[PDB]
Amino acid sequence: STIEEQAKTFLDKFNHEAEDLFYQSSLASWNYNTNITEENVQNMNNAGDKWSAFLKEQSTLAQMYPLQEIQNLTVKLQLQALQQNGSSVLSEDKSKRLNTILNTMSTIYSTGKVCNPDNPQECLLLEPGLNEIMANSLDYNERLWAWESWRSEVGKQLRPLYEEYVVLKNEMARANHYEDYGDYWRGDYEVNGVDGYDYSRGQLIEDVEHTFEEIKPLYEHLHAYVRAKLMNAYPSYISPIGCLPAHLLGDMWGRFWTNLYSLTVPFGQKPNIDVTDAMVDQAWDAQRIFKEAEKFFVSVGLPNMTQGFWENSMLTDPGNVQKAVCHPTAWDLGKGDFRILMCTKVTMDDFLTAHHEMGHIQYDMAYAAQPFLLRNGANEGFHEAVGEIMSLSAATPKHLKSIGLLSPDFQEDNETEINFLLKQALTIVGTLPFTYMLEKWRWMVFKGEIPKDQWMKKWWEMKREIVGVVEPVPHDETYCDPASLFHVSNDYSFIRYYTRTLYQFQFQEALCQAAKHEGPLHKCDISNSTEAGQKLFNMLRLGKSEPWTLALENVVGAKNMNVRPLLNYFEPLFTWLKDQNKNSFVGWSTDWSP
C-alpha cells in the first residue's frame, strides 16, 4: 500500500537504535563524570562521532518522506521532528566556517581575561571573584572601572563574531526556507492539525509582549522601593533624582537581586525562619534531604521514585580523590537509570533547588515510558517548570515548619509573608524584564531589521524604560553587554526561559487554587494535597504526543502563556508594594541621566 507502514517501521527502528546508541553516549558521559581520564575523553568523542553519523544517516533517510498525505497526528509529528537536522542542507564551507567561528567564540569567552590591574598574577578570576568584587563593594570607581574595562578587551570578539553567527544562521534558515534560526528555536513548540488552534511562530512573541506589559507595573513598584531604600541607605554618590547605573547591577548583567536585597532590608528587628540549628541538631545530610524529599513526594501523593536513585546514583560528591564540576546534574542515563550528581550542600534555597532536580528526575521517570521521539515534552520549558513546581511549593514557610525545620511557636506573622513575597519578586521579576530586553533584541538581530550599531539607542532605551539601568558613559562600537550574558553565546533560545517561568507559575496557580488551600494565598503547599499530585502526574507523562495548549488550558485555564498566575501568587506582593509606594513619587524620568 502506501508508505504508512514503512514510516511506522522507520520510526520504530530509529527509536530502538537511538535508544541503544544514545544510551552508550550517555554511558560515556557518566563514565567521564565518575572518573576523568583522557581515555574517557577519547571514548566519549568516539561515541559522539558514531552518534553524529547515525543522526545524519537517519535525517538522510527521513528527508524524502512527505507530510501532506500521511494524516496520522503522531506519525506526522514524529516524521517532521526526525526530518529536521539543522545545518546540513547547506554547502560544506558555510558549515565549517560556522564550526570554526563558534569554537573560537567559545575559546575567547572561556579564557577571556580580566582582573585587578594591580596584582594580575594571582587574583580573583572571572568567577566567582568578580561577583564578590562587584556586588560586595563600597566604592564604585573600581567597580565601574572593571565593568567598562570588561568589554574593552573581550567584546572585540563578541560583536563581530555574533554578526558572523547571525548571517550564517540566517542564510542556513534561507536554505531551510525560513527567516531566522530563532524561528527554528521556537519551532520545537510547533504543532498543527487542530481546528481553531493553528499555531504560528509570532503568537509566542506577542503573548510574551502582553505578559511583560502586565508585569511592568510590578517592576515599577519594585524598583520604586529599591530606589527609596538605596537612597535611605546609600547616600554616597547616587543622586536623589538619578537612576541605577551600570556599576550597581550586582551581576555580570544584573539577573539575580537577592544579593542586592541587603540594600533593601525592610525590617531586621523581627525574627524569620532559619534552619541552621535544625540542620546541625539532627545532622541533616544529602541522605536525609533525599529521605525527606521521598516523604514530600509521598505527602503530595505522587508515587515512589525508582531504585536508580537509591543504588545507582552516587548520593555524595566525588570526594577529593578526583576533581569534577558540581553543577546541578540530573541525568537520565536511559532504560530506568536516574541519577543526581552535585556537590551536596544543605540550605533552604538549596533544599528547593535539590527538589527542583528531583522533580526533573520524576519527570524523566514519567516520560521514560515513551519512545525516543516522545522522550521529551511538547515544549522544552516543561522540565524546569515541573521540577520547580515542588520548589515553589517548598518556598513557603508552612511545610518547612511542618518538617520541623524550626520550632512550632515561631510566628507565621505578616512580616515573613511580606519579606518572602519580596524575595520571590527579586528572584523572578528582578530578571524577567532583562529577559524581555535580550529576547526582543535577539529576535530583531536574527531577523535583521536592526542595524548592528543601532543597538546603542533602542536597547538602552528599554533600559531607560523597563529596568532602570544606565551607564556613566555611553557604550562604544564594540560594547555588547547582551553578549556578556553567559547563555547567549551558548546557542540558547533565550525565550524558553520566560516560557518556562510562565509554565511554572501557571502550574503553581493551578495547584494553589484547585487544592482548596486558604488563609494567606502564598501559604498553599502541595504536600498533603492528593488531588494536586494526581492531576500533576496525569499531565507530566505524555510528552509531545498531543498538543500542549489544550492541556495547559485544562490544568490552569490559559489558552497560552499568561502572567496572571504570577501576579496571583504576587497579590500579597502587589498589595504590599501599593501599601509602601504611596509615600512619594514612584518611577524615573527618561530625559535625566547621570
Next chain:
Amino acid sequence: KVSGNYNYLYRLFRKSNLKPFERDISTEIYQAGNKPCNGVAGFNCYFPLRSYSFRPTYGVGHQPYRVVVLSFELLHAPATVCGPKKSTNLVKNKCVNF
C-alpha cells in the same frame, strides 16, 4: 553481563500471524513496500531480528528475564504424570478404615 548480554537476538517481523505451538526461524525481510527489494536491504527493508539492550545498571522493565510454561493434553492418551497423593498413619492391631 556488565558490558551487556546480546548473544541472543529477538525476532520482530513476521508477515503471517502464528497459531499455538508455532515457531519462526526465517529472517526474510518484511517487504510491506512494493518497491523492489531482496536480499541486501535498502529502500524500506528492515531486518526482522532486532538487537537487545541488557546491562545490570538498568532500571525497571529492561533486565533479562526467564519465562517457562507448563502445558499438557487432556486425557486423550492415558494419564501419565501427576504428583503424590498425601497419606497418613497406617496403624497396627487397632480398628481403622483401610
